[PDB]
Every structure is written in structure tokens, then in C-alpha cells.
Amino acid sequence: ADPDPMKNTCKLLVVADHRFYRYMGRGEESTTTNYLIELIDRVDDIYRNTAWDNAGFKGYGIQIEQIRILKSPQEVKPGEKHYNMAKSYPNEEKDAWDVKMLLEQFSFDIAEEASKVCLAHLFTYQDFDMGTLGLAYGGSPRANSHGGVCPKAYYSPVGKKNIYLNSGLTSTKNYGKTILTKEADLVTTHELGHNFGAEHDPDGLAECAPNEDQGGKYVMYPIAVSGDHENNKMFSQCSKQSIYKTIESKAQECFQERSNA
Numbered sequence: 001a002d003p004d005p006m007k008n009t010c011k012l013l014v015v016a017d018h019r020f021y022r023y024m025g026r027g028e029e030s031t032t033t034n035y036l037i038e039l040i041d042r043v044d045d046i047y048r049n050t051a052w053d054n055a056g057f058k059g060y061g062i063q064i065e066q067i068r069i070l071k072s073p074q075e076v077k078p079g080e081k082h083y084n085m086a087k088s089y090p091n092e093e094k095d096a097w098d099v100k101m102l103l104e105q106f107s108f109d110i111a112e113e114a115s116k117v118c119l120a121h122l123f124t125y126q127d128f129d130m131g132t133l134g135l136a137y138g139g140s141p142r143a144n145s146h147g148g149v150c151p152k153a154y155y156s157p158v159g160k161k162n163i164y165l166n167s168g169l170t171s172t173k174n175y176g177k178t179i180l181t182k183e184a185d186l187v188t189t190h191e192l193g194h195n196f197g198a199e200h201d202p203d204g205l206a207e208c209a210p211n212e213d214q215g216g217k218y219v220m221y222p223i224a225v226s227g228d229h230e231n232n233k234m235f236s237q238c239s240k241q242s243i244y245k246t247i248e249s250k251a252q253e254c255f256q257e258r259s260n261a
């Protein structure tokens with residue numbers, strides 16, 4: 001405990017694809033960057049005020065190091081794909097990519113940039129099937145799965161190179177409409193939660209999945225309940241415990257000193 005102030009911030013590479021630029025940024029850089037800057041700051045407030053050990057072990061947050069703004073779609077040769085290409089993959093007739101394949105593609109395409117930052121996060125605007133809002137590596141119960149804060153290499157047999165699992169993505173479009181900013185905040189918080197090591201809160205542990213009359217669910221709950229209840233913007237005890245196991249070691253590995261605001 002007692003956090004290193006020279007290593008308490010996970011710097012992010014934030015990427016806005018052409019869809020986000022056009023539909024959230026109104027085709028303007030200022031509008032695009034302002035949205036992301038304010039979102040990450042509000043999310044940072046949640047992380048910073050969180051005591052991972054319920055004591056004084058808090059002060060860990062996130063800050064943007066760079067914001068890449070893709071104003072137009074990535075042109076590709078027949079048979080070639082890129083996370084910022086115009087068409088969705090694998091079904092170009094759908095509004096969005098298969099979310100898992102998009103996250104994989106993003107990681108592949110920005111691997112070089114990702115190797116130099118604590119985390120890389122893609123912000124897009126596409127309607128993933130069945131209400132999916134985001135995805136991220138880390139905090140997954142699945143076998144052989146890994147990822148999260150600090151670049152972790154994975155040799156892609158298909159890609160023929162190393163990609164890094166310190167990535168995640170957020171879409172601000174769901175069911176044909178732009179989601180509320182209060183809902184966007186929760187999605188990114190959730191995904192970065194996986195990056196920090198938390199898994200979904202299980203119903204089987206009432207402490208980590210309270211009823212609506214007890215403050216509601218916490219941010220790592222697998223279902224988007226509302227954002228209206230008091231617990232929604234907080235990390236449960238389960239999340240805190242999981243994130244506390246590796247946060248210090250990870251911090252020493254790739255966290256940096258908070259640049260002031």
C-alpha cells in the first residue's frame with residue numbers, strides 16, 4: 001500500500017475512428033477531443049477516489065497521453081481489413097463489426113503504438129449486435145485469456161507478429177441512438193475495469209451485486225442496468241480485491257506520474 005506518486009497514473013492512447021469523428025465529433029476535431037477529454041476525466045474521478053484496500057490505498061487514475069483522430073476511413077486493398085476501414089467486418093451489410101473481431105483488429109493495427117503506453121482505447125460509433133457497448137482484455141474468466149494495463153505480448157499466428165493486450169474499446173451508439181454521456185462514462189469505466197483486472201460482478205455474491213433498493217449494481221455488473229442508482233458509478237468490493245492484487249506491480253511496470261490539471 002501507500003502508492004508511488006511517480007507511478008500512479010496509467011497514460012492512455014485514445015483513438016477516435018472515423019465513425020466517432022463524424023457522428024460524435026460532428027466532423028470537428030475540437031468537439032471530438034473535448035468529448036473524450038471530459039469523459040476520461042470523469043472516469044478518472046472514479047478511479048482516483050477508489051480505495052482498492054478500503055484504507056488509504058487510492059490515488060490511482062488515468063490520463064490521456066495522446067488522442068489519435070481518424071477523420072476518414074482507412075482505405076484498404078481487396079481482402080485486406082483495418083479497424084478504421086469503411087465497411088463492418090465480417091458482415092459488411094451490418095452497421096457494426098463483430099465486437100470481438102474489432103477489438104482484435106484494433107490491437108493488431110496499433111500494436112506499435114500500444115507497446116509504448118499503459119493502455120490504448122478505441123472510441124467508435126457503431127451499433128454492436130444485441131446491445132453490446134464495449135469490450136476489453138483482462139478481467140476475463142475464460143481460460144488462456146490475458147491482457148490489461150501494461151503492454152503484454154501475444155504472438156498472432158494469423159497476424160504473423162506480436163500484438164499487445166493492453167487494449168479495449170467503447171461505442172457510444174446503441175439501438176440506433178447516441179447513448180447518454182452518463183451511460184458512456186459507465187461503459188468506459190467498465191472496460192477499463194477489465195484492463196485493471198476486474199471481472200464481472202456475480203449475482204451469487206450479494207455484497208458485489210446489491211438489489212436496486214440497496215444502491216443497485218456496481219460498474220462491473222455484466223448488464224447495463226441504468227446508471228441511475230448510487231452504486232452504478234462505483235467499483236464493488238469484488239472488483240477492488242481483484243484489481244488490488246496486481247495494481248501495485250503493474251503500476252511499477254508501466255504507470256507514470258500524474259501530469260497536473
Ligand SMILES: Cc1cc(COc2ccc([C@]3(C)CCN([C@H](C)C(=O)NO)C3=O)cc2)c2ccccc2n1
Nearest residue numbers: 132133134135183186190222223224225226227232
Ligand atoms: C450504461 C451502463 C453501463 C454499466 C456497466 O458497463 C457495462 C458495459 C457493457 C455491458 C454489456 C452490454 C454486457 C456485456 N458486454 C461486453 C461483452 C462486456 O462485458 N464488455 O466488458 C456489454 O457490452 C454491460 C455493462 C452499468 C453497470 C451498472 C448499472 C448501470 C450501468 N449502466
Ligand SMILES: [Zn+2]
Nearest residue numbers: 190194200222
Ligand atoms: Zn465486461
